[PDB]
Paper text:
The structure of single and tandem [name] domains from the streptococcal surface protein [name] were determined. We call SasG, Rib, and [name] “Periscope Proteins” due to their having variable-length stalk-like regions that define the distance that the N-terminal functional domain projects from the bacterial surface. Taken together, these data are consistent with multiple tandemly arrayed [name] domains from [name] behaving as an elongated, rod-like particle.
Defining the structural, rather than sequence, repeat boundaries in repetitive bacterial proteins is challenging. For [name] the T-REKS server predicts a repeat frame of 460 through 543 and 13 repeats of 84 through 90 residues. A construct based on the second repeat (residues 544 through 627; ΔN-Sgo_R2) was folded and solved to 0.95 Å resolution using X-ray crystallography utilizing ab initio molecular replacement (MR) with ideal fragments. Based on the significant truncation of the N-terminal β-strand (Inset), we hypothesized that shifting the frame of the repeat by seven residues toward the N terminus of [name] would complete the fold.
Author numbering: 542 to 569, 576 to 600, 610 to 625
Write the structure that this text describes.
Amino acid sequence: AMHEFVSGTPGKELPQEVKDLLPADQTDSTPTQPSKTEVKTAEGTWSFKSYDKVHFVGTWEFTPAPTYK
């Protein structure tokens, strides 16, 4: 079983901090969870949504950093 990640936020590509969480392949199913489900970047927060199914595709969503006005 192999894992892959995708962004579920329109127009936002995955950052390296998310790609660094990709699990290893499972040897010859239930997905391996990422080590953490929230990643902070300079621009905001990425949150793991879920896997959909062997290839497991894990969707991450982005929330921009809050602005103060």
